[PDB]
Amino acid sequence: SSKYAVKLKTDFDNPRWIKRHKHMFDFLDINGNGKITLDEIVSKASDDICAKLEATPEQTKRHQVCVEAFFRGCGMEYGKEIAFPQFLDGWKQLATSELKKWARNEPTLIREWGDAVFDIFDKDGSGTITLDEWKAYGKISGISPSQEDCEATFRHCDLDNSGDLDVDEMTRQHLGFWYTLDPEADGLYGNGVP
Numbered sequence: 385s386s387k388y389a390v391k392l393k394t395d396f397d398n399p400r401w402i403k404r405h406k407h408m409f410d411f412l413d414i415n416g417n418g419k420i421t422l423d424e425i426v427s428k429a430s431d432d433i434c435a436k437l438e439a440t441p442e443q444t445k446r447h448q449v450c451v452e453a454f455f456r457g458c459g460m461e462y463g464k465e466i467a468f469p470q471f472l473d474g475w476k477q478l479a480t481s482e483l484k485k486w487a488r489n490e491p492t493l494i495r496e497w498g499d500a501v502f503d504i505f506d507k508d509g510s511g512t513i514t515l516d517e518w519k520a521y522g523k524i525s526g527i528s529p530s531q532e533d534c535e536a537t538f539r540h541c542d543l544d545n546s547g548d549l550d551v552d553e554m555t556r557q558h559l560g561f562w563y564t565l566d567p568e569a570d571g572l573y574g575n576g577v578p
């Protein structure tokens with residue numbers, strides 16, 4: 385064996401990365417008081433999204449576990465209000481941890497959250513999400529309600545031979561979009577998210 389240096393592509397001080405997360409923070413900050421909690425995020429995931437997607441009790445439970453792990457990775461814990469500066473600092477730590485797992489080819493928290501979301505739409509067990517299924521998610525989660533933005537997502541990604549999207553591709557895109565500000569990921573959510 386031998387050691388090999390890999391560049392963890394981060395640009396945490398770039399306004400484009402900061403604004404991307406500020407947009408999402410405001411999106412989660414429903415009442416606009418500048419504070420959100422893990423409790424609210426989990427309620428959104430379980431009581432709102434999974435309920436409307438009619439996910440099974442077990443799929444909802446698994447999805448919740450992934451959401452809890454993901455945002456705890458950002459330093460969020462139940463019962464504690466979080467303002468943007470802390471939220472952003474948490475994303476810096478999450479991104480760094482994720483990118484290291486990525487370089488070591490160990491499953492990331494974003495990949496696992498992805499598995500849980502794709503599972504909900506896995507009617508035939510092939511593990512793919514169709515454009516119509518993504519449009520449903522975009523509208524219900526509210527991250528991308530625009531049909532055109534949802535089509536932009538699929539157009540942006542490299543789809544399988546049937547025109548559908550798989551988790552392996554989406555995970556790579558999400559990593560570049562949320563963690564690294566990779567130019568290859570720009571436009572992932574169309575005009576829905578900067």
Ligand SMILES: O=C1N2C=C(c3ccc(O)cc3)N=C(Cc3ccccc3)C2=N[C@]1(O)Cc1ccc(O)cc1
Nearest residue numbers: 405408409425428429494497498501525527554555558
């Ligand atoms: O990536 C995704 N997200 C990132 C953020 C988000 C939140 C805050 C930030 O600062 C940055 C990004 N918020 C939501 C929407 C959401 C939020 C809370 C609870 C449930 C859903 C969201 N849904 C995902 O498409 C779901 C998903 C994950 C992996 C896949 O392969 C496919 C689909």
Ligand SMILES: [Cl-]
Nearest residue numbers: 495552555556
């Ligand atoms: Cl992966």
